[PDB]
């Protein structure tokens, strides 16, 4: 940050530094996580340079600990990074000196992505091929689910970590045994067979253009 001298700068005001994302902590199995560090010293005016002794730390369960990368960026903030090895909580603990923050330190909990997210992980499904809900083969069969929510699907939520493999999602329910015969064709033709017009009409229609006289009879006078 700093370079028209190197003698003497402010160290920031734990009181007064603190620390965001975008909204509060989300962290995955599939990706590392993001957030950035303000600094602030002694009467509330952000740091006016940089490369101050700050420090991020990152907790799992039992016996886990590593250290996090803080940057400075040149500007009074800092970026981090950080990683959740386990499909379990972590913990974020973030250090200015040798005192905390706020917002941190926070707990969270490491999941793939958005699989199993709100509303999508009460996604329809037959229970077939498995002990619960899907068989873990693409195309298990020839519908995904068979409904129990009423009306179209302008009215029915989807939420999928992708529209073609996740479908629907409802959570609405009244007391009894109702149902609708349909879901979501997986494999197959939707309504088999072919469509077809009706004839009516048959042979024969059309008689001799007269009824022959089949005699004469008469004799000789």
């Given at each position: 940050h700093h370079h028209h001298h190197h003698a003497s700068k402010p160290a920031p005001s734990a009181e007064h530094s603190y620390a965001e994302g975008e909204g509060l902590v989300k962290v995955?199995?599939?990706a590392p996580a993001e957030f950035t560090i303000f600094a602030v010293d002694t009467k509330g005016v952000a740091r006016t340079d940089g490369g101050d002794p700050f420090e991020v730390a990152i907790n799992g369960p039992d016996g886990l600990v590593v250290d996090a990368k803080v940057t400075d960026n040149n500007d009074g903030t800092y970026g981090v990074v950080y990683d959740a090895p386990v499909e379990g909580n972590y913990?974020?603990?973030?250090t200015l000196r040798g005192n905390p923050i706020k917002n941190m330190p926070i707990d969270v909990k490491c999941?793939?992505?958005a699989n199993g997210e709100?509303?999508?992980f009460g996604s329809f499904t037959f229970t077939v091929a498995a002990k619960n809900k899907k068989?873990?083969?693409?195309?298990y069969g020839g519908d995904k689910f068979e409904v129990s929510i009423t009306g179209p699907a302008e009215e029915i939520t989807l939420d999928a970590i992708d529209n073609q493999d996740g479908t629907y999602t409802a959570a609405y329910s009244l007391v009894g045994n109702g149902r609708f015969s349909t879901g979501v064709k997986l494999n197959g033709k939707h309504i088999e067979g072919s469509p077809f017009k009706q004839v009516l009409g048959n042979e024969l229609f059309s008689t001799p253009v007269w009824i022959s006289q089949a005699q004469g009879i008469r004799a000789g006078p």
């Open positions: 995955f199995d599939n913990n974020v603990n973030v999941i793939e992505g709100d509303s999508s068989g873990e083969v693409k195309t």
